[PDB]
């Protein structure tokens, strides 16, 4: 239960702050079509003339899925502000899902005149793959998430997946999943669906920027008790003579003092400028791109290793594929102008992580001697070395929240490369589909496959509640900190607001790293 | 106790399946000679003219050791089948050892006519180095393990070890262990030895292959909300002009979509072909071999990092030293023909791990600009990078089970590089030796070292029971999976069977990765 | 336990009659060699030039097996007499096995002079395949059973088996069993082995002959109330005219009276005479032999369906392969003279079962009419028809006792075709083998297979006790019955006795069907 003329759920949609806790609960109203005419279909790069690196094999499903894996699905711009401006970190604790006031309509089109009526007896099916038995497509930054603006109605994305492929063909080990082979709950107007999940223990997300840097971590007023080789050729003597002179760590030469740690790992990336003139005249997008080679296919590393987007005084350049880029509502599908996208800046970590477009360092390459000169080389790729420390890619008000850690034998610091929390057991995929309704069948039994169905779609609200744990700050810093603030200068439109046509717009990407914390 | 005419143990040798458990208990009958005439001997590469990389210093011991560190010591071919075809993983829990029905014979050779009689009062000594105070030689894939075929009698290997060396000489820090300086139990016909060990907590071995690949892990039906730099030179305009055009993650271009993870680490290896014609005419075996340099000595990395043995459609090539190779019973000591060995194929992991003979990827090497062109380089060696995930080298019916994690300050994902479980405290080495029996001594005291002994050997059965924990599968996959199956086509001999001469033969190497599991 | 100088079992060997029960317990002393040098060997018809019907593939084992599946292993001639002369039936209830006073000797041959000494520490292994996991070879009438005469020492047969074969090659589904892969008990002089089994419920064996026949089962003094068509052409009328005259069952014409049952099933067999002159001059042994065709191979049906060996007054002929034939102790391997074998006579069942060399009957083959004449044919093969009744092949003092009912989906009246009791779970196969004893091994470890062993054999007594259930008789018959009796007429030797050289001899085959019982 209960009934047809009885709401099966209310509009819960608030935000509650409780010291070290904050419950965000937002509800949006959705629309679900009938996909593929209730058919599972094999799909492939086959006959697309697709590049060799773009081949793929998989299946498109008749099911739709719920996806709220974006911060703006839960935090209003103002809340996000509250969060990033006063806390050193946060993480998800537990969540709550709910489907209600579901209504199934049946459209009868004819003579251009289409009519929409209720089919009070139709059902919609749901089920959460809580045992992760289906391929996981959440956490690949796809569209179809809950809209940022509560007053927006959205369309549920269609669920499709991929599997092992050799060119545009499949292989023996390829897998095909049928979602109807999963116990799922059926609903009619008066029914509703609910379910709760608990997040696994996960590190707080570092919502702060360091107020010191690895190199500058010593006492500016005092020497060290350590010495380093300072000269191998004596100064003057009106001749250049071989020697071995040592000096001891001085504040006057911090760049040469023995230290305890190393910058973060790094996989260098090409650098491009926001002013076309500076760029080389060619299309190096794929040519000079940092790609990884997985079984014959190349794939751009994007955004790849967390690295400072640019060195100080140069928010002019950016890693060719080392920064998150969101599109403004104006941006088109492909080859859209620069001012139609928003490129994130990850320079807040230049204090501990290597800059993405530069060399990580220099390495000795030979054995110097009186007869052969000491040579070196530039290291462009650097794996994990003991003593390394680093910061992970920051998250954004419109970025991903989590991603499922692949189920592999081993894995290194599994933090989703494009921002987020790495979960061994993430929130499960919620699958929904309209059950088929056979149109009038022949008056004489026919065994051939049924392919005539009442055309219909469904609609209802969905509520998602998440309890977040805050990590308050207690900086003993004396001077004011940086804080996200809307510009007070007058203008035609207000940031994160609708316009004269009712189109909600997210002007810029907001990070979370404003508050300071020493190393 | 008990007595001379009383069996001190029975032939336990079965296999029991209990849902998530499986107890394999196999017993073989052994033969132990007298090694080195009861003498400890110093040994070295000294005076062998041995290469510089082959020098070594150590001691050969009068003791023998038990070694059952190979899967076929416990699993029959059929059992192995049962295992690999229905479980997603497994691991050792606890074991049980037992020595019994020991008999000591004394051979009296003369005039070519040798006679073997029982020495009812002789003793054999045993002891398990359960405190790991002796150099560990198990887990280096040596011969001498329990035979695969239960009906085979085997000879216990002789225990020898190495220590620090400088060329063919020793050093101050070198160590010399005397096994008689360990409390050991002595046995006569009527005695027996028993002992049980419990395995440490260890990850299940991944006995499955992925049904998806890192690159192809997204939803084939939906776009992303992320954008990437698509062109840096505008298309057409009857002129090639600098630009900055962005596109957004589309299914039509998966190879360029921002992702969350990276392929596994990699240390490139040379590639050789099974058809000599394709190979270069030279002996690059050591020349172009991937070697590591540890204190003046070079050593081939073999099999090294877990990497796909070859890309799709090429089970024709193989890493020069990146795959396990077992010899057929026909194979000789050295320089034996190809068809006398069996080369394992590790292509089951090409979904997550880099191919061993190819570059891991491409890296930007400079700072492009209108005046200087964007250049890149091929990365042949790649250390651990955050966001990396990978699969470990599979194990084989005739491969190692475990290896002792070296006792070092640090260590990375310590999974035995040539397959197996890394144990901090592995099953201890079981040492056995025939106690010396002085031949008739002079009738007048002489202090010089005793060197006249009754010639004798011993024999008895040994039982090893291991309880394995299974990780059942619950794949919601719809289509049939791949499964190990003996070929049904008729032939002269049955696989894993004796021939007309009674020689047991293991036709091919069986892996464990057949079942599928999505990423 | 217990000890070396301590007997581990006594010589139980009696027979006890207890009304409706009879316990036969006999013990014989055995000798077991080392077979195949402790090697499992593949064996086949390969390269024997063997006929197409004689191909086979299998393995010969290093194990020996105990077999007491012959009545004379338990019943003395006199006991057998007691049994067959006073009981209407009998069957096995429960049994008891025991191995003891086992002694292992080690032969050292040299210079033609061979010496046999005790190896007080050697072991012999035993185990009963009580789960029927090994191919069953008992119940195929092989030699190697316990000797009839208690004072005879015997050699344990070697255990070998067959499996699926295509010509002289094997197939995928072929099976290879290793007996060392079975938990088995080990014994030294002072040890012994014991085990008891309980027979399944099985029909008593019909140890009687019918004193009536199917056709002659009515009242000789009275008519029937039924009528039958007696003539279709009127008698006389000085002309032969069509008619329909009926008569009623009269004693004067029993051969035409309606009856209630039918004779037994039948598969006709060629007939041969004991006096060569009567036989056709050719070698029809295989030519005109009744063979069955199972997958390309032909096989003689022998002895096949239970049928009377010959009609009354003709114990001169016999079914070419429809009667059991035992060889006198004089008979050779092949092509031995008639008077060197003993051919059983199964005429005791001619009262209910069809004679083996004749047609089962006659059948109408067409539709007679004034224009076409009524024709018939001889039926040579007759399957089970409702209303059929029959007697099974009798057993002999020197015949089989039981056989294992094959594990097949279905099976018809599974009474072992060559006499005996069909058991779903028969007494298990008892397997015994001498454990190998490595001769002196090299003084330097060698991984190659061990192939040097102390030559030895074992010996001991074996006791088998069986409790049989008797089915006493209560015939109200007035006249004396037939009874097995030794001839009283004087002669040179006594039946079932040793001769002047100590050779026990079984003069004739004794059945069990002497007593009478009406239908
Ligand atoms: N930023 C981060 N750094 C390290 N680990 C993180 C992380 N975010 C999430 N994790 C994961 C969550 C858990 O999966 C844990 C790893 O668990 P397991 O893979 O060994 O079974 O750390
Ligand atoms: N495949 C695998 N991956 C990671 N660890 C493994 C492994 N197999 C065994 N181990 C080891 C077993 C334990 O030694 C544990 C490491 O323990 P510790 O060296 O820090 O004291 O992980
Ligand atoms: N002379 C005989 N007639 C009929 N059955 C006999 C028999 N002798 C033995 N049996 C078997 C013994 C049991 O196996 C029983 C059949 O059992 P199941 O094969 O249906 O499981 O009848
Ligand atoms: N960071 C890690 C250390 C060891 N093993 C892993 O899988 N990951
Ligand atoms: N994987 C590892 C991380 C940190 N320390 C180690 O020894 N190993
Ligand atoms: N006699 C029989 C009747 C039915 N089924 C059988 O297997 N046997």
PDB file of C-alpha atoms in Angstrom, chain C residues 203-378:
ATOM      1  CA  UNK C 203      16.221 -62.577  -3.231  1.00  0.00           C
ATOM      2  CA  UNK C 204      17.098 -66.089  -2.107  1.00  0.00           C
ATOM      3  CA  UNK C 205      18.829 -68.061  -4.854  1.00  0.00           C
ATOM      4  CA  UNK C 206      16.418 -70.679  -6.207  1.00  0.00           C
ATOM      5  CA  UNK C 207      18.156 -73.916  -5.179  1.00  0.00           C
ATOM      6  CA  UNK C 208      15.368 -76.164  -6.440  1.00  0.00           C
ATOM      7  CA  UNK C 209      13.891 -77.508  -9.657  1.00  0.00           C
ATOM      8  CA  UNK C 210      10.217 -77.310 -10.578  1.00  0.00           C
ATOM      9  CA  UNK C 211       8.137 -80.473 -10.370  1.00  0.00           C
ATOM     10  CA  UNK C 212       5.687 -79.203 -13.033  1.00  0.00           C
ATOM     11  CA  UNK C 213       5.962 -77.248 -16.281  1.00  0.00           C
ATOM     12  CA  UNK C 214       4.143 -74.159 -17.520  1.00  0.00           C
ATOM     13  CA  UNK C 215       2.111 -76.034 -20.138  1.00  0.00           C
ATOM     14  CA  UNK C 216       1.175 -78.912 -17.799  1.00  0.00           C
ATOM     15  CA  UNK C 217      -0.269 -76.849 -14.941  1.00  0.00           C
ATOM     16  CA  UNK C 218      -3.994 -77.650 -15.164  1.00  0.00           C
ATOM     17  CA  UNK C 219      -6.344 -80.255 -13.730  1.00  0.00           C
ATOM     18  CA  UNK C 220      -5.967 -83.449 -15.853  1.00  0.00           C
ATOM     19  CA  UNK C 221      -9.453 -84.538 -14.872  1.00  0.00           C
ATOM     20  CA  UNK C 222     -11.569 -81.552 -15.834  1.00  0.00           C
ATOM     21  CA  UNK C 223     -12.646 -79.515 -18.859  1.00  0.00           C
ATOM     22  CA  UNK C 224     -12.413 -75.732 -19.083  1.00  0.00           C
ATOM     23  CA  UNK C 225     -15.286 -73.286 -19.491  1.00  0.00           C
ATOM     24  CA  UNK C 226     -13.359 -71.644 -22.313  1.00  0.00           C
ATOM     25  CA  UNK C 227     -13.560 -72.529 -26.003  1.00  0.00           C
ATOM     26  CA  UNK C 228     -11.036 -72.183 -28.802  1.00  0.00           C
ATOM     27  CA  UNK C 229     -11.321 -72.218 -32.602  1.00  0.00           C
ATOM     28  CA  UNK C 230     -10.706 -75.892 -33.430  1.00  0.00           C
ATOM     29  CA  UNK C 231     -11.342 -76.147 -37.169  1.00  0.00           C
ATOM     30  CA  UNK C 232     -11.628 -73.678 -40.051  1.00  0.00           C
ATOM     31  CA  UNK C 233     -12.386 -76.403 -42.581  1.00  0.00           C
ATOM     32  CA  UNK C 234     -15.195 -78.884 -41.857  1.00  0.00           C
ATOM     33  CA  UNK C 235     -14.218 -82.535 -41.387  1.00  0.00           C
ATOM     34  CA  UNK C 236     -15.490 -84.794 -44.211  1.00  0.00           C
ATOM     35  CA  UNK C 237     -18.717 -83.929 -46.027  1.00  0.00           C
ATOM     36  CA  UNK C 238     -16.786 -85.771 -48.815  1.00  0.00           C
ATOM     37  CA  UNK C 239     -15.572 -82.203 -49.615  1.00  0.00           C
ATOM     38  CA  UNK C 240     -13.240 -79.730 -47.860  1.00  0.00           C
ATOM     39  CA  UNK C 241     -15.434 -76.789 -46.902  1.00  0.00           C
ATOM     40  CA  UNK C 242     -14.749 -73.544 -45.037  1.00  0.00           C
ATOM     41  CA  UNK C 243     -16.091 -73.462 -41.500  1.00  0.00           C
ATOM     42  CA  UNK C 244     -15.769 -72.279 -37.918  1.00  0.00           C
ATOM     43  CA  UNK C 245     -16.028 -75.083 -35.382  1.00  0.00           C
ATOM     44  CA  UNK C 246     -15.095 -74.515 -31.732  1.00  0.00           C
ATOM     45  CA  UNK C 247     -14.133 -77.009 -29.019  1.00  0.00           C
ATOM     46  CA  UNK C 248     -13.600 -76.452 -25.333  1.00  0.00           C
ATOM     47  CA  UNK C 249     -10.476 -76.993 -23.265  1.00  0.00           C
ATOM     48  CA  UNK C 250     -10.213 -80.717 -22.742  1.00  0.00           C
ATOM     49  CA  UNK C 251      -7.545 -82.789 -20.948  1.00  0.00           C
ATOM     50  CA  UNK C 252      -7.344 -84.714 -24.215  1.00  0.00           C
ATOM     51  CA  UNK C 253      -5.696 -81.640 -25.765  1.00  0.00           C
ATOM     52  CA  UNK C 254      -3.669 -79.727 -23.211  1.00  0.00           C
ATOM     53  CA  UNK C 255      -1.424 -78.268 -25.908  1.00  0.00           C
ATOM     54  CA  UNK C 256      -4.340 -76.130 -27.030  1.00  0.00           C
ATOM     55  CA  UNK C 257      -5.968 -74.991 -23.751  1.00  0.00           C
ATOM     56  CA  UNK C 258      -6.018 -71.282 -22.943  1.00  0.00           C
ATOM     57  CA  UNK C 259      -3.334 -70.616 -20.295  1.00  0.00           C
ATOM     58  CA  UNK C 260      -2.260 -67.768 -17.998  1.00  0.00           C
ATOM     59  CA  UNK C 261       1.498 -67.474 -18.466  1.00  0.00           C
ATOM     60  CA  UNK C 262       4.295 -67.549 -21.055  1.00  0.00           C
ATOM     61  CA  UNK C 263       7.722 -69.258 -21.050  1.00  0.00           C
ATOM     62  CA  UNK C 264      10.791 -67.176 -20.300  1.00  0.00           C
ATOM     63  CA  UNK C 265      12.458 -64.684 -22.669  1.00  0.00           C
ATOM     64  CA  UNK C 266      14.930 -66.063 -25.190  1.00  0.00           C
ATOM     65  CA  UNK C 267      17.840 -65.225 -27.525  1.00  0.00           C
ATOM     66  CA  UNK C 268      18.508 -68.368 -29.578  1.00  0.00           C
ATOM     67  CA  UNK C 269      21.981 -69.857 -29.719  1.00  0.00           C
ATOM     68  CA  UNK C 270      23.711 -72.269 -32.099  1.00  0.00           C
ATOM     69  CA  UNK C 271      23.865 -75.911 -31.079  1.00  0.00           C
ATOM     70  CA  UNK C 272      26.989 -78.085 -31.033  1.00  0.00           C
ATOM     71  CA  UNK C 273      27.391 -81.806 -30.323  1.00  0.00           C
ATOM     72  CA  UNK C 274      29.881 -83.492 -27.986  1.00  0.00           C
ATOM     73  CA  UNK C 275      30.570 -86.090 -30.706  1.00  0.00           C
ATOM     74  CA  UNK C 276      32.381 -84.247 -33.513  1.00  0.00           C
ATOM     75  CA  UNK C 277      30.812 -86.377 -36.254  1.00  0.00           C
ATOM     76  CA  UNK C 278      27.407 -84.683 -35.813  1.00  0.00           C
ATOM     77  CA  UNK C 279      28.917 -81.231 -36.171  1.00  0.00           C
ATOM     78  CA  UNK C 280      29.255 -79.406 -39.459  1.00  0.00           C
ATOM     79  CA  UNK C 281      32.800 -79.416 -40.830  1.00  0.00           C
ATOM     80  CA  UNK C 282      33.843 -75.779 -40.458  1.00  0.00           C
ATOM     81  CA  UNK C 283      34.906 -73.379 -37.702  1.00  0.00           C
ATOM     82  CA  UNK C 284      31.644 -71.578 -36.868  1.00  0.00           C
ATOM     83  CA  UNK C 285      32.845 -70.663 -33.368  1.00  0.00           C
ATOM     84  CA  UNK C 286      32.739 -66.960 -34.253  1.00  0.00           C
ATOM     85  CA  UNK C 287      31.046 -67.200 -37.651  1.00  0.00           C
ATOM     86  CA  UNK C 288      27.660 -68.533 -36.589  1.00  0.00           C
ATOM     87  CA  UNK C 289      27.951 -67.194 -33.068  1.00  0.00           C
ATOM     88  CA  UNK C 290      25.261 -65.141 -31.336  1.00  0.00           C
ATOM     89  CA  UNK C 291      27.040 -61.786 -30.900  1.00  0.00           C
ATOM     90  CA  UNK C 292      25.955 -58.371 -29.652  1.00  0.00           C
ATOM     91  CA  UNK C 293      27.122 -55.181 -31.346  1.00  0.00           C
ATOM     92  CA  UNK C 294      28.263 -52.469 -28.926  1.00  0.00           C
ATOM     93  CA  UNK C 295      29.776 -49.455 -30.692  1.00  0.00           C
ATOM     94  CA  UNK C 296      31.509 -51.051 -33.657  1.00  0.00           C
ATOM     95  CA  UNK C 297      32.752 -54.008 -31.598  1.00  0.00           C
ATOM     96  CA  UNK C 298      31.127 -57.429 -31.566  1.00  0.00           C
ATOM     97  CA  UNK C 299      31.107 -59.572 -28.461  1.00  0.00           C
ATOM     98  CA  UNK C 300      29.855 -63.133 -28.008  1.00  0.00           C
ATOM     99  CA  UNK C 301      26.744 -63.370 -25.814  1.00  0.00           C
ATOM    100  CA  UNK C 302      28.085 -65.848 -23.276  1.00  0.00           C
ATOM    101  CA  UNK C 303      26.410 -67.448 -21.442  1.00  0.00           C
ATOM    102  CA  UNK C 304      23.625 -64.985 -22.089  1.00  0.00           C
ATOM    103  CA  UNK C 305      19.959 -65.562 -21.328  1.00  0.00           C
ATOM    104  CA  UNK C 306      19.149 -68.397 -18.984  1.00  0.00           C
ATOM    105  CA  UNK C 307      17.852 -71.222 -21.173  1.00  0.00           C
ATOM    106  CA  UNK C 308      17.577 -75.000 -20.943  1.00  0.00           C
ATOM    107  CA  UNK C 309      20.857 -76.434 -22.229  1.00  0.00           C
ATOM    108  CA  UNK C 310      19.012 -79.084 -24.241  1.00  0.00           C
ATOM    109  CA  UNK C 311      15.593 -80.704 -24.507  1.00  0.00           C
ATOM    110  CA  UNK C 312      14.810 -83.991 -22.745  1.00  0.00           C
ATOM    111  CA  UNK C 313      16.883 -87.057 -23.725  1.00  0.00           C
ATOM    112  CA  UNK C 314      19.808 -85.129 -25.242  1.00  0.00           C
ATOM    113  CA  UNK C 315      22.436 -84.224 -22.646  1.00  0.00           C
ATOM    114  CA  UNK C 316      24.558 -84.863 -25.756  1.00  0.00           C
ATOM    115  CA  UNK C 317      24.304 -81.346 -27.210  1.00  0.00           C
ATOM    116  CA  UNK C 318      24.877 -77.902 -25.718  1.00  0.00           C
ATOM    117  CA  UNK C 319      24.489 -74.164 -26.528  1.00  0.00           C
ATOM    118  CA  UNK C 320      27.616 -73.017 -28.358  1.00  0.00           C
ATOM    119  CA  UNK C 321      28.147 -70.387 -25.682  1.00  0.00           C
ATOM    120  CA  UNK C 322      25.134 -70.735 -23.443  1.00  0.00           C
ATOM    121  CA  UNK C 323      26.579 -72.847 -20.659  1.00  0.00           C
ATOM    122  CA  UNK C 324      29.281 -72.371 -18.048  1.00  0.00           C
ATOM    123  CA  UNK C 325      32.452 -74.361 -18.700  1.00  0.00           C
ATOM    124  CA  UNK C 326      35.114 -74.937 -16.033  1.00  0.00           C
ATOM    125  CA  UNK C 327      38.414 -76.539 -16.824  1.00  0.00           C
ATOM    126  CA  UNK C 328      39.709 -79.659 -15.105  1.00  0.00           C
ATOM    127  CA  UNK C 329      43.140 -79.120 -13.541  1.00  0.00           C
ATOM    128  CA  UNK C 330      44.579 -80.790 -16.653  1.00  0.00           C
ATOM    129  CA  UNK C 331      43.094 -78.312 -19.193  1.00  0.00           C
ATOM    130  CA  UNK C 332      45.529 -75.993 -20.925  1.00  0.00           C
ATOM    131  CA  UNK C 333      45.375 -72.314 -21.829  1.00  0.00           C
ATOM    132  CA  UNK C 334      43.847 -72.627 -25.275  1.00  0.00           C
ATOM    133  CA  UNK C 335      42.483 -75.213 -27.699  1.00  0.00           C
ATOM    134  CA  UNK C 336      42.379 -77.963 -25.123  1.00  0.00           C
ATOM    135  CA  UNK C 337      40.544 -81.261 -25.657  1.00  0.00           C
ATOM    136  CA  UNK C 338      36.937 -81.762 -24.618  1.00  0.00           C
ATOM    137  CA  UNK C 339      37.693 -84.093 -21.693  1.00  0.00           C
ATOM    138  CA  UNK C 340      39.794 -81.379 -20.100  1.00  0.00           C
ATOM    139  CA  UNK C 341      36.825 -79.173 -19.397  1.00  0.00           C
ATOM    140  CA  UNK C 342      33.504 -79.640 -17.601  1.00  0.00           C
ATOM    141  CA  UNK C 343      30.381 -78.252 -19.256  1.00  0.00           C
ATOM    142  CA  UNK C 344      27.504 -77.337 -16.957  1.00  0.00           C
ATOM    143  CA  UNK C 345      23.989 -78.561 -17.724  1.00  0.00           C
ATOM    144  CA  UNK C 346      21.133 -76.166 -17.129  1.00  0.00           C
ATOM    145  CA  UNK C 347      18.335 -78.511 -18.144  1.00  0.00           C
ATOM    146  CA  UNK C 348      16.767 -78.275 -14.674  1.00  0.00           C
ATOM    147  CA  UNK C 349      14.885 -75.179 -15.941  1.00  0.00           C
ATOM    148  CA  UNK C 350      13.399 -76.693 -19.117  1.00  0.00           C
ATOM    149  CA  UNK C 351      10.105 -76.548 -17.214  1.00  0.00           C
ATOM    150  CA  UNK C 352       9.776 -72.808 -17.447  1.00  0.00           C
ATOM    151  CA  UNK C 353      12.575 -71.479 -19.647  1.00  0.00           C
ATOM    152  CA  UNK C 354      12.897 -71.981 -23.434  1.00  0.00           C
ATOM    153  CA  UNK C 355      15.533 -74.396 -24.709  1.00  0.00           C
ATOM    154  CA  UNK C 356      18.571 -72.402 -25.842  1.00  0.00           C
ATOM    155  CA  UNK C 357      19.139 -73.993 -29.256  1.00  0.00           C
ATOM    156  CA  UNK C 358      15.552 -73.972 -30.472  1.00  0.00           C
ATOM    157  CA  UNK C 359      13.057 -71.368 -31.608  1.00  0.00           C
ATOM    158  CA  UNK C 360      11.046 -69.713 -28.846  1.00  0.00           C
ATOM    159  CA  UNK C 361       7.939 -70.177 -30.934  1.00  0.00           C
ATOM    160  CA  UNK C 362       5.940 -69.371 -34.044  1.00  0.00           C
ATOM    161  CA  UNK C 363       4.260 -66.117 -35.104  1.00  0.00           C
ATOM    162  CA  UNK C 364       1.644 -65.194 -37.667  1.00  0.00           C
ATOM    163  CA  UNK C 365       3.245 -63.089 -40.384  1.00  0.00           C
ATOM    164  CA  UNK C 366       0.321 -62.156 -42.654  1.00  0.00           C
ATOM    165  CA  UNK C 367      -3.419 -61.660 -43.054  1.00  0.00           C
ATOM    166  CA  UNK C 368      -4.916 -64.910 -44.383  1.00  0.00           C
ATOM    167  CA  UNK C 369      -7.974 -64.904 -46.616  1.00  0.00           C
ATOM    168  CA  UNK C 370      -9.546 -67.114 -49.247  1.00  0.00           C
ATOM    169  CA  UNK C 371      -7.070 -65.685 -51.763  1.00  0.00           C
ATOM    170  CA  UNK C 372      -3.899 -65.538 -49.640  1.00  0.00           C
ATOM    171  CA  UNK C 373      -2.704 -68.430 -47.414  1.00  0.00           C
ATOM    172  CA  UNK C 374      -2.016 -68.144 -43.660  1.00  0.00           C
ATOM    173  CA  UNK C 375       1.766 -67.982 -43.218  1.00  0.00           C
ATOM    174  CA  UNK C 376       3.959 -67.948 -40.113  1.00  0.00           C
ATOM    175  CA  UNK C 377       7.578 -67.556 -39.082  1.00  0.00           C
ATOM    176  CA  UNK C 378       9.945 -68.816 -36.434  1.00  0.00           C
TER     177      UNK C 378
END
